[PDB]
Specification:
Radius of gyration of chain A: 33 Å
Strand content of chain A: 35-45%
CATH topology of the largest domain in chain A: Beta-galactosidase, Chain A, domain 5
Number of strands of chain A: 58
Number of domains of chain A: 5
PDB class: hydrolase
Helix content of chain A: 10-25%
Bound molecules: 1-methylethyl 1-thio-beta-D-galactopyranoside, magnesium ion, sodium ion
CATH class of the largest domain in chain A: Mainly Beta
CATH architecture of the largest domain in chain A: Distorted Sandwich
Protein name (chain C): Beta-galactosidase
Largest sheet of chain A: 12 strands, antiparallel
Structural class of chain A: mainly beta
Family (chain C): Belongs to the glycosyl hydrolase 2 family.
Shape of chain A: globular
Oligomer: part of a larger assembly
Number of helices of chain A: 12
Organism (chain C): Escherichia coli (strain K12)
Subunit structure (chain C): Homotetramer.
Distance between the termini of chain A: 81 Å
């Protein structure tokens, strides 16, 4: 039969899809959502055997355990147990494209379980097995008898086992196929794994049972009144004595309740549904649900007899909220949303694709703490608990069908094909049947990167017809097709158009106004956070706030998909594509998250938190105007803290309670600003703090911040009469300067400061030299490759230009004595294949105070690619415990990604100045620094810097962070200017013009002195 | 050109057509017809089938065709003759001036139907003037309305030819048989003969 | 597998649908819609035997003619040949409503044909069989080997027989079921044949 190579067969004997059931036999347990005795978990230790193909599976396995099998935990992905390699491929299918066939060598996991079944479950009622997740297709046998088959690795497959079980011990056998015709619709950009990876359960239902229930909530014009409508269907023998009661609870208070016998209204010439009934309940002044205040009620649906005996009860959490698109705006409860979203795959570094509650909670909390209010289920229906958590903690969810055919050519080859309609329809229809009662789901998605075909149009209308309560979106085919209610592009930029043929990505501001366009625009993916990224993030947020119809987006993406590997010594390290011998693969493209696989944040996360803040501020005089971007709640768990400091030194501060209605404003007068005693720049910082803990944050959580410069008093105070005058000693090879116990040496042939001593201690391992390059970021590399260079990527432009190969040529090296100092003057050219790339002119003035003033004027040829940086670098001989600076921080920040950082005096251990991106690159810069302290050294100016135990050379030569080794000393990069990091996308040049170093001539100055 | 989908005997009529599990099967009936017949100029309108109520499957399929072949309108009478799955109001047996206000699926007078609040589609009866036996009384009343009202664009009489079958007597002589004459039961007797012409094509 | 009681299986190994083809190898012929040597009719005299249920059909029939069979003209409705009664029901289904199952007693028509295929057809290219109308579902075998299955009594079902035929004589075996899950979608007010 080879059902796994026939898209016309997506299952055999599988039961209908439906919302989460537990078959409680006590209404109160249903109301309180307690564990039901009728819903058993079969998770735990199973038996498992790996085979190279289904043909190799022995028939004996159907009836008995194979002795060579191992005992393993289920749910699991068999790759995470080492049976075979997980593969990381992005677009290209992991199997040859020859639909609907799959390789003959098709890894097959044989799982089995011996378990008991109580006679009470068999004597009456129906016992079914439910597999919430099997990747990618499977056959099921019970007690050696075949039961059925199922596909769609992302939704539950259920089978009735009533006639196959016997009281006592029973055996289940599951043959799981890694590949199947289903794989053609599962080409998402993630690790390709397989197995029984989601829960396995047994559910007992009465023969006369609730077989489906739909709950809807409609409102009057101002949401002050609602009608709860619950349509209930039954299976079994209809009897006049049957009844349905639907009751609605708000905590312990019964808000409403209604009962009726079965028998729906007339539908057509043939009548109505005798096996269904609709209950309608009136609710006055309902508590509305939103991500802001996730108010929930509990709906309990009881199937019972007239006399009152309960047959069974089902239930769900209900959130009263309306989602509609009107006048081109996505409204929730009549207010336009601003989606602060993120795409989140289900990934664990140890367990692969198996999800657990702990991890889900951890994620949700971090999300909320970081000012996210929405999540897109990229790109398949999630483990069921996810929705329950979003409903309760409050997150808007985009639920997305498990359909992705990115690897086809062209992309809609299958989706425009009627033969694939059935398979696709199941992926959509079964998702809706399962999740439609969850308030957190506000928008349905037809899948991802599958082009646009007629099948989409068919399914878009199906959904609109069955569930008018939620908009439908879909990005394929150009983001604004007839299959989407929302313009939902991926990586369209804010101002810049990318006019690709057929499926252009217009600037989002322009897209809204194309002739005839009226829909809202919410990016389904934007700001690709791969490595050191998120540059330009503030530009999106500024546009979102200015344009009503720009209603936000989902960052790509939440968490890095790295997997743990163990070295020779058993130590763990983070692996990416290719690290399992998987080939071909897409290397580091699987790590695009705001957080590391273990949940530790990347620096980008703070930039997202700040730009996604819910309070905006303005300053005028001593007036701070706070505006609330909340749509529904008042600021009843917030205080405003303010502090004024002079170059890092606290002068004053205070706190004022925040009392702003949704969308309102509050004016706070700051008190009289006592002058200050000292030159310096005064800075005002404000922070919004939540005094009380909440379900998702601890007391004291900071939810918003902003800074402003206040007055500045330039220093007009002429120094002092230097105690001494440095001495210059000239020799054929060098210019030496001595002053007290310090000495500086300038080599006359290289033209650089090659050594500096404090007493008899050398302070340098490598001379101080100009640096114009950086160890390329993921964004600089883009898709360029060794075996296939992308000439357009920044890294390739710089390579080709000779930037990493150019060598300094001396032009001038002179020494002069002035009245109280010695002045060294130098000039160098950097050339490549006879072309002058850069010219650096400097002066070093060493005075009686021991301060060394460095002036740098650089020329950059106009025709060379704009350089990554214009700075100096050196390897210091020493290593020190801390790094202290007055500049932006505390975390890593770059020119196009520094809004979240604050100007202040920061002090961290050296290691925190290094960002352990899995794929190493330039990292840890801090910009806007006026003073930097390390060991006995102090550098003053207006620069950007990074400091760590790793040379740029090392970072660029090293593929994985676990392979980096601390070098001797400390490498310090101090930049007058540094290029933006980009990130609009990571497969093309993405650094905005304004962040490129294209001025041609640059000047910067620094003072190096001893502390 | 009409899809081979009719589920008249279900209770209610859209039991299967509103069931996603029957979407695939229905889908092949509509898609394979369009793929086969879309180059014939004589086909001017596609129909989703007949007397199968109105279910979400219809909506999906109506959209499918609109997407693949914009060149022809799509009609479907199920569920009231004026649902979201039809470009043309295409009732069966709606009368000229007299309303028949059945619950859920009324059959309004055709003149009145055109102008119900918000209605703007053309109206062409998919079936009218049931020519069973000595019939066709009131035919001229339809025609007078069709000519007076722009949006009343005609209709398809029910139907062309009697579905009578030939049987042979004891003497071997032939005779026209109907429902129940083959031992078939239950059966609907003479309801199978509704045509303007006899089974041999002689006109009534 | 009782494919005829499962709406999830409406065909097996069936070729994609498409507009009328004739594969002319002369363009002039195509211009004038003349008969094509590449489009052959299998209409005429076939072998047929009636059974009360699919379970009653003998395996032998897959490989050789049943001597009991009769010779009849195809196309035809077997009711018109007297093998069983045609039924005239308007709305009410002719079988009990219990989707997607059908009666156990399900009249089965076993059709077969021995026909010649020239080597020229097999040396190059693809040879497919086209059944323009089979009511209501059927399985097909060619030279004793199973080929595929089809539903929808009103559209053509096509199968690639390239790998199943041999030069000279060949034998098709078609088992046609009167009722199937497809009958649930075929309740038109007309004789049921
Ligand atoms: C590399 C582009 C041509 S496709 C690009 O790849 C990304 C890599 O993380 C994501 O998967 C995006 O969804 C996809 O559009
Ligand atoms: C008799 C009605 C309830 S159904 C009525 O029966 C007719 C009889 O010829 C036709 O089949 C019609 O299409 C059908 O609407
Ligand atoms: Mg299959
Ligand atoms: Mg993709
Ligand atoms: Mg590769
Ligand atoms: Mg009768
Ligand atoms: Mg079938
Ligand atoms: Mg010829
Ligand atoms: Mg022979
Ligand atoms: Mg009918
Ligand atoms: Na906006
Ligand atoms: Na990726
Ligand atoms: Na407050
Ligand atoms: Na690197
Ligand atoms: Na008219
Ligand atoms: Na009739």
């Amino acid at each position: 039969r080879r059902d796994w190579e026939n898209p016309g067969v997506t299952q055999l004997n599988r039961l209908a899809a439906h919302p989460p059931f537990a078959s409680w036999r006590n209404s109160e347990e249903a109301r309180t959502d307690r564990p039901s005795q009728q819903l058993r978990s079969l998770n735990g230790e199973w038996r498992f055997a790996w085979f190279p193909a289904p043909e190799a599976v022995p028939e004996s396995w159907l009836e008995c355990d194979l002795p060579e099998a191992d005992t393993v935990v289920v749910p699991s992905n068999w790759q995470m147990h080492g049976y075979d390699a997980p593969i990381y491929t992005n677009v290209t299918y992991p199997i040859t494209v020859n639909p609907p066939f799959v390789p003959t060598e098709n890894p097959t996991g044989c799982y089995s379980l011996t378990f008991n079944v109580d006679e009470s479950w068999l004597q009456e009622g129906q016992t079914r097995i439910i597999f919430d997740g099997v990747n990618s297709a499977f056959h099921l046998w019970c007690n050696g008898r075949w039961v059925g088959y199922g596909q769609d690795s992302r939704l539950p497959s259920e089978f009735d086992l009533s006639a196959f079980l016997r009281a006592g011990e029973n055996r289940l056998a599951v043959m799981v196929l890694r590949w199947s015709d289903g794989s053609y619709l599962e080409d998402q950009d993630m690790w390709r794994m397989s197995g029984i990876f989601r829960d396995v359960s047994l559910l007992h239902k009465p023969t006369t049972q609730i077989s489906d229930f739909h709950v809807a909530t409609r409102f009057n014009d101002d949401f002050s009144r609602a009608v709860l409508e619950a349509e209930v269907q039954m299976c079994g023998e209809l009897r006049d004595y049957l009844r349905v009661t639907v009751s609605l609870w708000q905590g312990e208070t019964q808000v409403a309740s209604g009962t009726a016998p079965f028998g729906g209204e007339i539908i057509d010439e043939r009548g109505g549904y005798a096996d269904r009934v609709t209950l309608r309940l009136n609710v006055e002044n309902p508590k509305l649900w939103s991500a802001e205040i996730p108010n929930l009620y509990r709906a309990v649906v009881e199937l019972h007899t007239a006399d009152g005996t309960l047959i069974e009860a089902e239930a769900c959490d209900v959130g009263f909220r309306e989602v509609r698109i009107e006048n081109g705006l996505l409204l929730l409860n009549g207010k336009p949303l601003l989606i602060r979203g993120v795409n989140r795959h289900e990934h664990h570094p140890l367990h692969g694709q198996v999800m657990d509650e702990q991890t889900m909670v951890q994620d949700i909390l971090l999300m909320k703490q970081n000012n996210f209010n929405a999540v897109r289920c990229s790109h398949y229906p999630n483990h069921p608990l996810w929705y329950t958590l979003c409903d309760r903690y409050g997150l808007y969810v985009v639920d997305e069908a498990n359909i992705e055919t990115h690897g086809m050519v062209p992309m809609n080859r299958l989706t425009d094909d009627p033969r694939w309609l059935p398979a696709m329809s199941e992926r959509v229809t079964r998702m809706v049947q399962r999740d439609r009662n969850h308030p957190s789901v506000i928008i349905w998605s037809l899948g991802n990167e599958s082009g646009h075909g007629a099948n989409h149009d068919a399914l878009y209308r199906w959904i609109k017809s069955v569930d008018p309560s939620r908009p439908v979106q879909y990005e394929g085919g150009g983001a604004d097709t007839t299959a989407t209610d929302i313009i939902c592009p991926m990586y369209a930029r804010v101002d810049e158009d990318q006019p690709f043929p057929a499926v252009p990505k217009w600037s989002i501001k322009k897209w809204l106004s194309l002739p005839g366009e009226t829909r809202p625009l919410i990016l389904c993916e934007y700001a690709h956070a791969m490595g050191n990224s998120l540059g330009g993030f503030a530009k999106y947020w500024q546009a979102f706030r200015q344009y009503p119809r720009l209603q936000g987006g989902f960052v790509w993406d939440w968490v890095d998909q790295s997997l743990i590997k163990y070295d020779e010594n058993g130590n763990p390290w983070s692996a990416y594509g290719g690290d399992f011998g998987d080939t071909p693969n897409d290397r580091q493209f699987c790590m695009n998250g705001l957080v590391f696989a273990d949940r530790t944040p990347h620096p980008a996360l703070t930039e997202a938190k700040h730009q996604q803040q819910f309070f905006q501020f303005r300053l005028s005089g001593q007036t701070i105007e706070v505006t609330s971007e909340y749509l529904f709640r008042h600021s009843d768990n917030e205080l405003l803290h303010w502090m004024v400091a002079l170059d890092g030194k606290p002068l004053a501060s205070g706190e004022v309670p925040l009392d702003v209605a949704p969308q309102g404003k509050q004016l706070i007068e700051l008190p009289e600003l006592p002058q200050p005693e000292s030159a310096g720049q005064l800075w005002l910082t404000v922070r919004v703090v939540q005094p009380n803990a909440t379900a998702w944050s601890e007391a004291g959580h900071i939810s918003a911040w902003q800074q402003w410069r206040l007055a500045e008093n330039l220093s007009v105070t002429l120094p002092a009469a230097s105690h001494a005058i440095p001495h210059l000693t000239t020799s054929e090879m060098d210019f030496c300067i001595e002053l007290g116990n310090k000495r500086w040496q300038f080599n006359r042939q290289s033209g650089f400061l090659s050594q500096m001593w404090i007493g008899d201690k050398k302070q340098l391992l490598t001379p101080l030299r100009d640096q114009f390059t950086r160890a390329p970021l993921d964004n600089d590399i883009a898709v360029s490759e060794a075996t296939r260079i992308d000439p357009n990527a920044w890294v390739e432009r710089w390579k080709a230009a000779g930037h990493y190969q150019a060598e300094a040529a001396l032009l001038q090296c002179t020494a002069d004595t002035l009245a109280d100092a010695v002045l060294i003057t130098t000039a160098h050219a950097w050339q490549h294949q006879g072309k002058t790339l850069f010219i650096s002119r400097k002066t070093y003035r060493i005075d009686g105070s021991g301060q060394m003033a460095i002036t740098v004027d650089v020329e950059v040829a106009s025709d060379t690619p704009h350089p990554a940086r214009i700075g100096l670098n050196c390897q210091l001989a020493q290593v020190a415990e801390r790094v202290n600076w007055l500049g932006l921080g505390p975390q890593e920040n770059y020119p196009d990604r520094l809004t979240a950082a604050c100007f202040d005096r920061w002090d961290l251990p050296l290691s925190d100045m290094y960002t352990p991106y899995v794929f190493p690159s330039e990292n840890g810069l801090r910009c806007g620094t006026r003073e930097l302290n390390y060991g006995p050294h102090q550098w003053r100016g207006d620069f950007q810097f990074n400091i760590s135990r790793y040379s740029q050379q090392q970072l660029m030569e090293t593929s994985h962070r676990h392979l980096l080794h601390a070098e001797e000393g400390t490498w310090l990069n101090i930049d007058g200017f540094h290029m933006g990091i980009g990130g609009d996308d990571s497969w093309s040049p993405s650094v905005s013009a304004e962040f490129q170093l294209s001025a041609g001539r640059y000047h910067y100055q620094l003072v190096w002195c001893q502390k």
